[PDB]
Design a protein around this ligand. Structure first.
Ligand code: HEM
Ligand code: HEM
Ligand code: H4B
Ligand code: H4B
Ligand code: ARG
Ligand code: ARG
Ligand code: ZN
Lengths: 420, 420
């Protein structure tokens, strides 16, 4: 079946066939399309109370092994059979199986390549995998994480990496990081009702306070690492401030921008997602890349539910903040995003503008169809939050579907935890 | 059954129940979502060569009548019941029916209310209907269209209106305007490969030329109205220039913008669409509203597949047109959109900025849920192509579905029509 995909900007046409190997878990039906649901149950992998029944695990395990060995330009016929045989045994004798070191590396990279919402996928093959499946205590998790942070930060020359903690066995012995990101700022609900800091982390900040963390009521306070070792209650750890690289915001023209006293961290490390590989689940697998300007400038800074600094900037710029039609909102957002890119560049830290990112993704998408004839793509997430149609991804028709390996969301640990 | 959708910017939630009455025709499967396809077959409504079977039409006819009488605040028990039998009898005898003049008024306004891609639906219950089902000749159609244009243009103060041509019967006697829009610039393919004018009209203009139209090889050449009556062959008609209101483009601060010598028509009138009312189809039904700034500024002017003035303006502003990270494209887009709004305000022509548009639609969507417990919406088309996340529609989760009445696309006439 050849579902024809077309790019109305360049006339480029694609034939998607890969969508057949997809897992039919999406909620979209013939009567209604719900592609705009942010965090659907379909892309979520809930917690369990008992291991995956060997009956549904086996076919998935083999399916993965086939894909792994099939990825080789060569033909390893023997090793392939030996492994598929070895795994089948392990599942029938232990109820689960372990991935080899190389299979894990292929798994993580392939899952990235399968992330329909990631726009930096042109780098899918360039990832540093840290094996921490041997981990056993929260204290060790902290050390593994600091290793990751020290690496990926790399004195400003950010580089992608991922740390894989021991897979899910019972579902009662989960190894996971509660924090949405390794590095994130605190959010505090102030007495006057307003929120000081990042609104997105108000709830998680409370959890940190309940666990003992002392609030500092600042706008950019780095939240402590809330780590969980095999089902045990989580323990707090403070990322040494030396490892947290930040960039102070400033404009190449508006010297008053410094007055806003803004800043942001350099490392975007999502930490609460789950890696699914041939039936196995890794609830603890923090990964990172480098930032795309708009993520901070448009979203983190101008969302009403985030720092919301838009009006303050429009006023400082002396724009008509009352006449909407003045397009004051659009100028402000642009100057803010310039401040971001500028600041990261003046401080020798890796950042990527949304134009360069988009053009690189087109190159990537093309490679996908030429190689494996398919590319899972969520238009709603790939198109930048500012100047949408000015980028080629806006003009690209795309199919969104779930494959395997894959990075699923999770129900934030605390909401389902069984405290002791 | 309730499907919950939330707006992450305001926190507000809605419970959609209206999606149950949707016609299951969307191509989104459980395995893959194709909501990013521009003009899918599901939203298209092809040609016929055999009338709609009365067997098949009766349900749809009754359904509309009930929906019609259901709109009234009172109760018209008597007239309702009478109309139901009158229609049943009429379809039984003739094999089709004729909606009353007032029903046509309701249908057009309702189909607008049911257009999931229109962001200006807040104006739904405000439309001027021109009943032209009595029409019989191409010449007549032209006379009707000229009425619509004069009425809607209203010397600057734009007004919404729709002109309904005779309903399809055999499917061999269609009455329709082949033009994508009433007023639209031509596009020529110059001898050096390049394109002069609007690229999106190359094929259409070529047709006009084939039909004896003299290419004026200019940039903003208003292409002739290609009308079709009773399924005959189309006849050319040049819309009287005095009726075509244009707006000269100029910036409030950039004196040199005038030198760009740009302009655009004030009347956005989609002609090539099909209105479906209770099983009946009208291949001819031009409609219009007023422009939203971004349609001209972001799309028509900046698209690579359109006028593509982006680089010219950038160089004109003296921006680093070679360093993407300078965000010159974004600054250029903003000023171009500021020029569009300014030009219209100056010439006293009606236009709406995407910010006022989105905030008005936010109110419309809330009312729809209060009213019918639903509001079909295509996120991908509703979020402005500029500063997406700065508008509330960006943060609004939504369901997209086909109701009735509705405005469907069609297969471009020349692409199917059999020439006499
Ligand atoms: C090379 C740098 C990278 C860039 C520039 C990039 C950029 C992006 C962007 C712009 C998003 C949207 C996030 C949001 O709007 O909240 C995204 C999402 C995502 N990316 Fe990447 N990415 C990079 C690296 C990675 C890596 C290394 C992985 C995984 C191994 C990855 C996995 C994903 C996933 C799964 C999402 C979805 C996050 C969510 O749903 O909240 N990305 N990426
Ligand atoms: C009050 C003024 C109106 C505004 C501000 C408005 C605005 C819009 C916008 C921005 C679009 C997208 C245009 C594009 O990207 O091609 C649109 C689409 C649409 N509007 Fe409205 N609209 C208005 C009136 C109308 C009227 C009067 C009708 C019908 C009677 C209507 C029916 C639709 C439909 C069917 C679409 C889809 C067009 C397509 O798919 O090509 N709109 N409208
Ligand atoms: C409602 C809608 O799904 C939601 O606002 C989405 C839109 N697109 C997005 N795209 C990205 N990259 N990130 C987001 O958080 C969102 N939010
Ligand atoms: C590929 C994608 O569907 C296409 O570029 C869409 C995106 N959103 C749009 N939205 C509007 N209003 N109009 C368009 O023409 C488009 N183009
Ligand atoms: N490029 C990335 N790795 N992005 C990961 C998500 C970062 C998130 N959007 C933030 O603003 O903090
Ligand atoms: N506001 C409207 N009625 N828009 C209808 C579509 C007009 C089309 N987007 C154009 O730029 O020509
Ligand atoms: Zn869908």
């Amino acid at each position: 079946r050849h579902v024809r995909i077309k790019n109305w900007g360049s006339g480029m046409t694609f034939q998607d066939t890969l969508h057949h190997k997809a897992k039919g878990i999406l909620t979209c039906r013939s009567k209604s399309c719900l592609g705009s649901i942010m965090t659907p149950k379909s892309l979520t992998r809930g917690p369990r109370d008992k291991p995956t029944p060997p009956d549904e695990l086996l076919p998935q395990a083999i399916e993965f092994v086939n894909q792994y060995y099939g990825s080789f330009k060569e033909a390893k016929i023997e090793e392939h059979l030996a492994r598929v045989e070895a795994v089948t045994k392990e599942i029938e004798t232990t109820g689960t199986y372990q991935l080899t070191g190389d299979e894990l590396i292929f798994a993580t990279k392939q899952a990235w390549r399968n992330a329909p919402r990631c726009i930096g996928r042109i780098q899918w093959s360039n990832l540093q995998v840290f094996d921490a499946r041997s981990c056993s205590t929260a204290r060790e998790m902290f050390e593994h994480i600091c290793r990751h942070v020290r690496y990926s930060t790399n004195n400003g020359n950010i580089r992608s990496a991922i740390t894989v903690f021991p897979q899910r066995s019972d579902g009662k012995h989960d190894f996971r990081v509660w924090n949405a990101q390794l590095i994130r700022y605190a959010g505090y609900q102030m007495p006057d009702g307003s929120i000081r800091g990042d609104p997105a982390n108000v709830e998680f900040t409370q959890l940190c306070i309940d666990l003992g963390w002392k609030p500092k009521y600042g706008r950019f306070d780095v939240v402590p690492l809330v780590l969980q070792a095999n089902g045990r209650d989580p323990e707090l750890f403070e990322i040494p401030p030396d490892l947290v690289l930040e960039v102070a915001m400033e404009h190449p023209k508006y010297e008053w921008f410094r007055e806003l006293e803004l800043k942001w961290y350099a490392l975007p490390a999502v930490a609460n997602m789950l890696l699914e590989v041939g039936g196995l689940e890794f609830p603890g697998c923090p990964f990172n890349g480098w930032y795309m300007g708009t993520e901070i400038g448009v979203r983190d800074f101008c969302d009403v539910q985030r720092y919301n600094i838009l009006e303050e900037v429009g006023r400082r710029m002396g724009l008509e903040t009352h006449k909407l039609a003045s397009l004051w909102k659009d100028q402000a957002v642009v100057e803010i995003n310039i401040a971001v890119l500028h600041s990261f560049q003046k401080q020798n830290v890796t950042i990527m503008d949304h134009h360069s990112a988009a053009e690189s993704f087109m190159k990537y998408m093309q490679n996908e169809y030429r190689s494996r004839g398919g590319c899972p793509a969520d238009w709603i997430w790939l198109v930048p939050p500012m100047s949408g149609s000015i980028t080629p991804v806006f003009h690209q028709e795309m199919l969104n579907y779930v494959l395997s390996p894959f990075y699923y969301y999770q129900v934030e640990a605390w909401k389902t935890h069984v405290w002791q």
